[PDB]
Design a protein around this ligand. Structure first.
Ligand code: NAG
Ligand code: NAG
Lengths: 101, 101
């Protein structure tokens, strides 16, 4: 969509213990699955359009379901192969995600 | 199923204030109902298969719904008729469920 007039749209957390987008920050799961048709035990994130922050419509929702644990990690950008990078900024104040801390 | 390879499966509490199996411990309801198709206001317990505790699949879910109150009790084993047993172990430390305490 275009930002025509005072229209806006977004995902919202809805009732999940994470947000769409924010799961790119090294959030971990034993298994995670998404749908545009409802899925059992899963939380739902409303795809909300609104006009002027004054009228709001759930133009759809995203249904998301997961196991806690790990083996699945959400990440900022692409990765390849067996070899894995370590990226570190020495001696400068830094925001870090080190061995899932 | 057989425990072939590292496969396992279970019910989990999901989002319920009880577990399947554990409701056999004298848990009480005004009404309770179960389904394999979704039911309104009810919590859902995921029927999870997993491999090696490392990949997990909701092979189904159990949907469960209830009223609080009583007249329905979950119990360990069968019962019959109008007459009801009292089973007590005097003078030895014991785990008890006495008049729903
Ligand atoms: C480390 O992260 C920064 C963030 O932009 C990126 O520019 C850089 O390419 C990364 N280094 C490696 C080795 O991936
Ligand atoms: C009392 O509970 C024990 C637990 O195993 C059982 O073996 C016994 O038969 C019970 N007694 C009665 C009267 O049901």
């Amino acid at each position: 969509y275009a930002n025509v007039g005072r229209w806006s749209a977004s995902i919202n957390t809805g009732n999940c213990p994470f947000s769409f987008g924010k799961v790119n920050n090294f959030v971990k799961f034993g298994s995670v699955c998404f749908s545009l048709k409802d899925i059992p035990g899963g939380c739902a994130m409303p795809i909300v359009a609104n006009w002027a922050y004054s009228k709001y419509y759930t133009i759809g929702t995203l249904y998301v379901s997961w196991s806690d644990g790990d083996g699945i990690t959400g990440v900022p950008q692409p990765v390849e192969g067996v070899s894995s990078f370590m990226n570190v900024t020495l001696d400068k104040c830094t925001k870090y995600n080190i061995y899932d801390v």
